[PDB]
Write a protein that holds these residues in place. Structure first.
Motif, mmCIF file in Angstrom:
data_model
loop_
_atom_site.group_PDB
_atom_site.id
_atom_site.type_symbol
_atom_site.label_atom_id
_atom_site.label_comp_id
_atom_site.label_asym_id
_atom_site.label_seq_id
_atom_site.Cartn_x
_atom_site.Cartn_y
_atom_site.Cartn_z
ATOM 1 N N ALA A 75 1.123 10.432 -13.171
ATOM 2 C CA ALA A 75 1.971 10.697 -11.985
ATOM 3 C C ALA A 75 2.277 9.356 -11.311
ATOM 4 C CB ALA A 75 1.303 11.686 -11.054
ATOM 5 N N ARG A 76 1.239 8.540 -11.134
ATOM 6 C CA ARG A 76 1.377 7.239 -10.432
ATOM 7 C C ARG A 76 2.282 6.330 -11.258
ATOM 8 N NH1 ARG A 76 -4.144 8.276 -8.458
ATOM 9 N NH2 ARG A 76 -3.923 8.347 -6.189
ATOM 10 N N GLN A 77 2.098 6.302 -12.578
ATOM 11 C CA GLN A 77 2.976 5.493 -13.469
ATOM 12 C C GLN A 77 4.448 5.954 -13.363
ATOM 13 O OE1 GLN A 77 1.568 2.760 -15.164
ATOM 14 N NE2 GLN A 77 3.763 2.334 -14.923
ATOM 15 N N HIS A 78 4.718 7.256 -13.463
ATOM 16 C CA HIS A 78 6.093 7.849 -13.392
ATOM 17 C C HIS A 78 6.706 7.598 -12.003
ATOM 18 C CE1 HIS A 78 5.026 9.843 -17.193
ATOM 19 N NE2 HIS A 78 6.309 10.171 -17.309
ATOM 20 N N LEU A 79 5.897 7.668 -10.956
ATOM 21 C CA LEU A 79 6.391 7.376 -9.586
ATOM 22 C C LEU A 79 6.857 5.922 -9.510
ATOM 23 C CD1 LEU A 79 3.733 9.417 -7.628
ATOM 24 C CD2 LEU A 79 6.202 9.766 -7.392
ATOM 25 N N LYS A 80 6.058 4.977 -10.003
ATOM 26 C CA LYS A 80 6.407 3.538 -10.062
ATOM 27 C C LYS A 80 7.683 3.356 -10.898
ATOM 28 C CE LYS A 80 5.626 -0.571 -12.630
ATOM 29 N NZ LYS A 80 4.524 -1.561 -12.574
ATOM 30 N N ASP A 81 7.842 4.077 -12.026
ATOM 31 C CA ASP A 81 8.912 3.880 -13.049
ATOM 32 C C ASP A 81 10.194 4.658 -12.694
ATOM 33 O OD1 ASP A 81 7.070 2.339 -14.607
ATOM 34 O OD2 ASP A 81 6.667 3.980 -15.993
ATOM 35 N N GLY A 82 10.188 5.428 -11.605
ATOM 36 C CA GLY A 82 11.329 6.250 -11.167
ATOM 37 C C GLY A 82 11.593 7.399 -12.122
ATOM 38 N N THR A 83 10.569 7.882 -12.819
ATOM 39 C CA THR A 83 10.708 8.963 -13.834
ATOM 40 C C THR A 83 9.863 10.169 -13.399
ATOM 41 O OG1 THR A 83 9.011 7.914 -15.116
ATOM 42 C CG2 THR A 83 11.306 7.394 -15.732
ATOM 43 N N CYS A 84 9.782 10.422 -12.101
ATOM 44 C CA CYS A 84 8.942 11.510 -11.541
ATOM 45 C C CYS A 84 9.822 12.460 -10.749
ATOM 46 C CB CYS A 84 7.852 10.962 -10.621
ATOM 47 S SG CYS A 84 6.606 12.195 -10.164
ATOM 48 N N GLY A 85 9.703 13.759 -11.025
ATOM 49 C CA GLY A 85 10.409 14.793 -10.253
ATOM 50 C C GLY A 85 9.436 15.587 -9.416
ATOM 51 N N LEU A 86 9.976 16.419 -8.538
ATOM 52 C CA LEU A 86 9.220 17.231 -7.569
ATOM 53 C C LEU A 86 9.722 18.655 -7.713
ATOM 54 C CD1 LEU A 86 7.261 17.252 -5.129
ATOM 55 C CD2 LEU A 86 9.256 16.863 -3.689
ATOM 56 N N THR A 117 0.842 -1.224 0.000
ATOM 57 C CA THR A 117 0.000 0.000 0.000
ATOM 58 C C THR A 117 0.867 1.260 0.000
ATOM 59 O OG1 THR A 117 0.025 0.249 2.341
ATOM 60 C CG2 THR A 117 -1.711 -1.209 1.404
ATOM 61 N N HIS A 118 2.125 1.144 0.434
ATOM 62 C CA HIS A 118 3.077 2.281 0.452
ATOM 63 C C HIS A 118 4.409 1.853 -0.153
ATOM 64 C CE1 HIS A 118 0.126 4.115 3.153
ATOM 65 N NE2 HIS A 118 0.710 5.287 2.875
ATOM 66 N N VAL A 119 5.077 2.801 -0.810
ATOM 67 C CA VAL A 119 6.398 2.557 -1.456
ATOM 68 C C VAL A 119 7.329 3.711 -1.091
ATOM 69 C CG1 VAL A 119 5.596 3.546 -3.662
ATOM 70 C CG2 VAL A 119 7.630 2.068 -3.593
ATOM 71 N N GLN A 120 8.515 3.374 -0.575
ATOM 72 C CA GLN A 120 9.585 4.348 -0.258
ATOM 73 C C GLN A 120 10.165 4.844 -1.577
ATOM 74 O OE1 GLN A 120 12.245 2.469 2.442
ATOM 75 N NE2 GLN A 120 11.037 3.039 4.246
ATOM 76 N N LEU A 121 10.118 6.154 -1.798
ATOM 77 C CA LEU A 121 10.690 6.783 -3.007
ATOM 78 C C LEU A 121 11.583 7.935 -2.577
ATOM 79 C CD1 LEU A 121 7.435 6.964 -5.110
ATOM 80 C CD2 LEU A 121 9.221 5.213 -5.269
ATOM 81 N N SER A 122 12.624 8.179 -3.372
ATOM 82 C CA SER A 122 13.514 9.361 -3.276
ATOM 83 C C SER A 122 13.314 10.159 -4.566
ATOM 84 C CB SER A 122 14.946 8.946 -3.071
ATOM 85 O OG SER A 122 15.154 8.528 -1.730
ATOM 86 N N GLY A 172 12.799 8.235 7.718
ATOM 87 C CA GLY A 172 13.074 9.544 7.083
ATOM 88 C C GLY A 172 12.061 9.909 5.997
ATOM 89 N N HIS A 173 11.265 8.937 5.542
ATOM 90 C CA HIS A 173 10.273 9.071 4.446
ATOM 91 C C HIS A 173 8.950 9.630 4.972
ATOM 92 C CE1 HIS A 173 12.548 6.831 1.296
ATOM 93 N NE2 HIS A 173 13.237 6.533 2.399
ATOM 94 N N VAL A 174 8.611 10.846 4.539
ATOM 95 C CA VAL A 174 7.312 11.512 4.837
ATOM 96 C C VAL A 174 6.212 10.772 4.076
ATOM 97 C CG1 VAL A 174 5.994 13.666 4.714
ATOM 98 C CG2 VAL A 174 8.425 13.721 5.284
ATOM 99 N N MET A 175 5.134 10.426 4.772
ATOM 100 C CA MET A 175 3.993 9.751 4.124
ATOM 101 C C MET A 175 3.216 10.814 3.360
ATOM 102 S SD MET A 175 2.655 6.819 6.709
ATOM 103 C CE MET A 175 1.449 6.559 5.419
ATOM 104 N N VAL A 176 2.925 10.533 2.101
ATOM 105 C CA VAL A 176 2.273 11.517 1.206
ATOM 106 C C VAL A 176 1.209 10.782 0.417
ATOM 107 C CG1 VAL A 176 4.308 12.994 1.034
ATOM 108 C CG2 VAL A 176 3.903 11.200 -0.692
ATOM 109 N N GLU A 177 0.280 11.563 -0.115
ATOM 110 C CA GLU A 177 -0.665 11.089 -1.143
ATOM 111 C C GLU A 177 -0.799 12.146 -2.241
ATOM 112 O OE1 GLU A 177 -4.131 10.211 1.013
ATOM 113 O OE2 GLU A 177 -3.900 11.993 2.272
ATOM 114 N N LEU A 178 -1.394 11.741 -3.354
ATOM 115 C CA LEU A 178 -1.583 12.590 -4.560
ATOM 116 C C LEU A 178 -2.925 13.318 -4.481
ATOM 117 C CD1 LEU A 178 -0.137 10.404 -7.428
ATOM 118 C CD2 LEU A 178 1.011 11.901 -5.851
ATOM 119 N N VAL A 179 -2.906 14.614 -4.802
ATOM 120 C CA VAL A 179 -4.101 15.475 -5.029
ATOM 121 C C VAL A 179 -3.913 16.275 -6.323
ATOM 122 C CG1 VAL A 179 -5.383 17.434 -4.052
ATOM 123 C CG2 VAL A 179 -4.508 15.583 -2.556
#
Length: 113
Positions: free
Chosen positions: A32-43, A2-7, A70-77
């Motif tokens: 956004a969800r696809q790019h987050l999974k694929d490691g191709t998402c910036g902030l 249900t959660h994935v650690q991302l940098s 160290g990972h802040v829990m976030v969701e998409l809006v």
């Protein structure tokens, strides 16, 4: 899981080559969800004058809780013409495709997936 650690690579708004994920709330959340999974998402960190330089609909990551490993829990809006789809906490920034821009920093997040 249900959660994935991302940098997430933090990009300067003026470096960003692809300034949004698509043309509908549903498409930008999808992409956004696809790019987050694929490691191709910036902030991009939101300050005065950032959002008008990016394309709507916007996808935000928002703090979903008060930070495992160290990972802040976030969701998409998403946001389109001042209406948000989702309800969450403080904005950590706006998501954009990452196509090899050099980041200024990394933001460790735990993404509700």
């Amino acid at each position: 899981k249900t959660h994935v650690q991302l940098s997430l690579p933090v990009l300067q708004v003026r470096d960003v080559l692809v300034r949004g994920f698509g043309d509908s709330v549903e498409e930008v959340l999808s992409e956004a969800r696809q790019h987050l999974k694929d490691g191709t998402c910036g902030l991009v960190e939101v300050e005065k004058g950032v959002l008008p330089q990016l394309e709507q609909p916007y996808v935000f990551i928002k703090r979903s809780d008060a930070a495992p490993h160290g990972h802040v829990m976030v969701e998409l809006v998403a946001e389109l013409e001042g209406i948000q789809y989702g309800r969450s906490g403080e904005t950590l920034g706006v998501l954009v495709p990452h196509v090899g821009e050099i980041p200024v920093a990394y933001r460790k997040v735990l993404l509700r997936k």
